[PDB]
Design a protein around this motif. Structure first.
Motif, PDB file in Angstrom:
ATOM      1  N   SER A  98       0.816  -1.218   0.000  1.00  0.00           N
ATOM      2  CA  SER A  98       0.000   0.000   0.000  1.00  0.00           C
ATOM      3  C   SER A  98       0.852   1.272   0.000  1.00  0.00           C
ATOM      4  O   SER A  98       0.431   2.298  -0.553  1.00  0.00           O
ATOM      5  CB  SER A  98      -0.943  -0.008   1.204  1.00  0.00           C
ATOM      6  N   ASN A  99       2.063   1.214   0.582  1.00  0.00           N
ATOM      7  CA  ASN A  99       3.017   2.319   0.445  1.00  0.00           C
ATOM      8  C   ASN A  99       3.537   2.434  -0.986  1.00  0.00           C
ATOM      9  O   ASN A  99       3.716   3.549  -1.505  1.00  0.00           O
ATOM     10  CB  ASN A  99       4.180   2.169   1.427  1.00  0.00           C
ATOM     11  N   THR A 103      -5.860  -3.780  -1.188  1.00  0.00           N
ATOM     12  CA  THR A 103      -6.785  -3.004  -2.007  1.00  0.00           C
ATOM     13  C   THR A 103      -6.966  -1.618  -1.406  1.00  0.00           C
ATOM     14  O   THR A 103      -7.473  -1.485  -0.288  1.00  0.00           O
ATOM     15  CB  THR A 103      -8.146  -3.691  -2.133  1.00  0.00           C
ATOM     16  N   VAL A 104      -6.561  -0.593  -2.153  1.00  0.00           N
ATOM     17  CA  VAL A 104      -6.579   0.793  -1.695  1.00  0.00           C
ATOM     18  C   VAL A 104      -7.552   1.579  -2.567  1.00  0.00           C
ATOM     19  O   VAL A 104      -7.447   1.555  -3.800  1.00  0.00           O
ATOM     20  CB  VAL A 104      -5.170   1.418  -1.743  1.00  0.00           C
ATOM     21  N   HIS A 130     -18.092   0.400  -7.840  1.00  0.00           N
ATOM     22  CA  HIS A 130     -18.006  -0.859  -7.116  1.00  0.00           C
ATOM     23  C   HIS A 130     -17.135  -1.875  -7.837  1.00  0.00           C
ATOM     24  O   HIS A 130     -17.330  -2.124  -9.028  1.00  0.00           O
ATOM     25  CB  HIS A 130     -19.378  -1.474  -6.851  1.00  0.00           C
ATOM     26  N   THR A 131     -16.171  -2.450  -7.103  1.00  0.00           N
ATOM     27  CA  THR A 131     -15.358  -3.582  -7.539  1.00  0.00           C
ATOM     28  C   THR A 131     -15.445  -4.697  -6.506  1.00  0.00           C
ATOM     29  O   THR A 131     -15.964  -4.486  -5.406  1.00  0.00           O
ATOM     30  CB  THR A 131     -13.879  -3.212  -7.712  1.00  0.00           C
ATOM     31  N   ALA A 132     -14.933  -5.879  -6.861  1.00  0.00           N
ATOM     32  CA  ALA A 132     -14.818  -7.001  -5.936  1.00  0.00           C
ATOM     33  C   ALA A 132     -13.685  -7.917  -6.370  1.00  0.00           C
ATOM     34  O   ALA A 132     -13.371  -8.018  -7.559  1.00  0.00           O
ATOM     35  CB  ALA A 132     -16.097  -7.830  -5.844  1.00  0.00           C
ATOM     36  N   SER A 133     -13.098  -8.604  -5.390  1.00  0.00           N
ATOM     37  CA  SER A 133     -12.066  -9.597  -5.641  1.00  0.00           C
ATOM     38  C   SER A 133     -12.036 -10.617  -4.512  1.00  0.00           C
ATOM     39  O   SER A 133     -11.627 -10.311  -3.389  1.00  0.00           O
ATOM     40  CB  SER A 133     -10.683  -8.952  -5.788  1.00  0.00           C
TER      41      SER A 133
END
Lengths: 113, 49, 113
Positions: A18-19, A94-95, A78-81
């Protein structure tokens, strides 16, 4: 003192990715507005910079970097995984990100060898 | 309020990714809680003796 | 002659994975209009049906399915996915689907262990 950072360098450390995602996003997009001709450069630059500094961690993983970038015009995002890995070794980052003009979701993964 | 709402949304986004980096680093610094805990225990026993 | 059949039994064919994505999209979505409370279970059921039909193959893979479902409001959409795999065994599948109200993008991945 040495085996603990060796355990840091071997498991999927979830949000140092995430960094790498925020450095990729803040290098690529910046505070620019939505113009659609630069969106392909912005998505490609976030994904290439995230694959640039996940390869310099030195961790034995297979990395998958996906990036969705969305124009703020009243359409809502909207997304999904859900995936299929070995749960003790792998994980998912996920950011979400936005400004006045644009939305962004980057989902990033690491799959052990 | 463009600037304050941008700085406040940047404060919320950067605050939440540091919350996620905290939620990553509780494992790494939890074994550093373990490391500094038996370090303080060993140096405690040495300095009591 | 058994090595060719053993290589075909663990290869990532993009077309079979794309047909699994087509059957999961047409099973969960159908052709019904954009209801945003249903977009959550549409993304849930497309990822869960794709993960169900991909794990019935028996191939030694680790599977990642990401799904994007989006209303047609005149807003702009880029999704990008470069990854980091072994190129001899692994592959990907990204499928664009649309109806009258909505755009559906499903990126499906399969990475050998």
């Amino acid at each position: 003192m040495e085996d603990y950072q060796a355990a840091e360098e071997t498991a999927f450390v979830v949000d140092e990715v995430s960094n790498i995602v925020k450095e990729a996003i803040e290098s690529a997009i910046g505070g620019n507005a939505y113009q659609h001709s630069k969106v392909n450069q912005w998505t490609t630059n976030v994904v290439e910079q995230t694959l640039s500094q996940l390869t310099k961690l030195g961790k034995p993983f297979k990395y998958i970097v996906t990036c969705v970038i969305m124009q703020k015009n009243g359409a809502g995002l909207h997304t999904a995984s859900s995936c299929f890995w070995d749960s003790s070794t792998d994980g998912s980052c996920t950011v979400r990100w936005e400004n006045k003009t644009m939305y962004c979701i980057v989902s990033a993964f690491g799959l052990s060898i | 309020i463009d600037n304050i709402e941008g700085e406040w949304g940047a404060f919320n986004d950067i605050m939440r990714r540091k919350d996620s980096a905290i939620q990553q680093q509780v494992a790494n610094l939890q074994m550093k809680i373990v490391q500094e805990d038996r370090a303080v225990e060993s140096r405690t026993t040495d300095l009591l003796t």
